[PDB]
C-alpha cells in the first residue's frame, strides 16, 4: 500500500460586481431650459388718428 492520503480540494471562488444595474434620474440630462418671455406686448404709442 502507499499511505500519505489521496487528495483534497480547497473551497475558493473568483469575484465580480456582476455589471449591476440601478435607476438614475440625474443621468438623463445635460442641458438647462431656455428663459421665459421678457418682452412687453400691451404697450401703445397713443396716436390721435
Amino acid at each position: 500500500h502507499v499511505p500519505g492520503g489521496g487528495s483534497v480540494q480547497i473551497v475558493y471562488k473568483p469575484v465580480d460586481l456582476s455589471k449591476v444595474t440601478s435607476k438614475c434620474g440625474s443621468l438623463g440630462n445635460i442641458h438647462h431650459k431656455p428663459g421665459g418671455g421678457q418682452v412687453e406686448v400691451k404697450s401703445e404709442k397713443l396716436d390721435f388718428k
Binding site: 499511505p3 500519505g4 492520503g5 489521496g6 487528495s7 475558493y12 473568483p14 469575484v15 465580480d16
Partner: protein, 111 residues
C-alpha cells in the same frame, strides 16, 4: 495590529468577544480562550503517521478484529485524517490576494 502573521487574513477579523458580569467564586475578573491556529495540523499529522507505521505491519490488530471490527475501517479512518491534515496544510498560507470571474478571449493578434 501587533501581528497579522499568526491570524488568517482572508477572515477579516478572526475574533468573537463576550463580557459576562459575574466572575468565578474567589476571583475578581477572568477570560476563557478558544482558538484554531492551523499549526494544529501537526497533531493529526503525528496521529496518522504513527497509525500508518504500526498498521503497515498489522501490529495489535488481532485484539481489534476479535471484537469483530473490520480490517478495511483502519484504512478508512487514517485516509480521512490524511484528508483532514491536508485541509489545514492547504488553508495555511492561503490567499487574501484577489481573482476575478474573467475568462480567456481570442480578441487580439500577436504583438
Amino acid at each position: 495590529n501587533k501581528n497579522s502573521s499568526y491570524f488568517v487574513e482572508w477572515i477579516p477579523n478572526n475574533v468573537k468577544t463576550a463580557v459576562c458580569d459575574i466572575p468565578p467564586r474567589g476571583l475578581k475578573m477572568s477570560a476563557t480562550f478558544i482558538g484554531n491556529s492551523t499549526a494544529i495540523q501537526e497533531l493529526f499529522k503525528r496521529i496518522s503517521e504513527q497509525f500508518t507505521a504500526m498498521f503497515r505491519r498489522k501490529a495489535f490488530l488481532h485484539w481489534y478484529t476479535g471484537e469483530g471490527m473490520d480490517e478495511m475501517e483502519f484504512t478508512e479512518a487514517e485516509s480521512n485524517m490524511n484528508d483532514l491534515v491536508s485541509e489545514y496544510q492547504q488553508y495555511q498560507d492561503a490567499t487574501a490576494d484577489e481573482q476575478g470571474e474573467f475568462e480567456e478571449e481570442g480578441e487580439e493578434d500577436e504583438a
